[PDB]
Amino acid sequence: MNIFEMLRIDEGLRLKIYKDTEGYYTIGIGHLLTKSPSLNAAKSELDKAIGRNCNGVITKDEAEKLFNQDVDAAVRGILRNAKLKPVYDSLDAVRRCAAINMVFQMGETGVAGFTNSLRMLQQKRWDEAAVNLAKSRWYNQTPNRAKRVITTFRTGTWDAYK
């Protein structure tokens, strides 16, 4: 198991525009296109992302290209973030994957919330961090996925994905 296999489990693969768990137009392996309710706006974003006229449909190769870019972008965002980088650097490789997973799903908009979770993770207080992480809109709205990610932070193993 690695971050690509982990996020492929959590996000799936769909080759036509679909709505994500929040109702937002998405394609591929969890590639968010737009939060606008306009399907036309989403199709424009898709064409811009692929560099061709797609009318809402892509191939698996193209979905995987966006996926590689999106994982890369999540990592690079963690490393540029003054609050996230020290915690990320403090973690082992498996727990780093859990961190990338959360930033893939939610961007960096939830860093100020999760301040306390971040401190517990840096302190390696794993059971306490797991309790705090679950006290969240994230957990309530996507509980099965959050439970998998939280188990990964708690244990440093892939048990929740096997």
Ligand X SMILES: Nc1ccc(CCCc2ccccc2)cc1
Residues that bind ligand X (CB under 6 A): 78, 84, 87-88, 99, 102-103, 106-111, 114, 117-118, 121
Which C-beta is closer to ligand X: that of 13 or that of 113?
113
**Shortest-Cβ-distance residue relative to ligand X:** 110
Asked whether the beta carbons of 122 and 86 are under 8 A apart, the reply is: yes
Q: Which residues are catalytic?
A: 11, 20
The overall longest dimension of the chain from CA atoms, in Å, is 49
CA atoms within 13 A on the CB side of 103: 26
CB of 53 to ligand X, least distance (A): 33
Long-range own/partner contacts, residues 88-94 (CB < 8 A, 24 or more apart)? 90/121, 90/122, 90/124, 91/121, 92/156, 94/152, 94/156, 94/157, 94/158
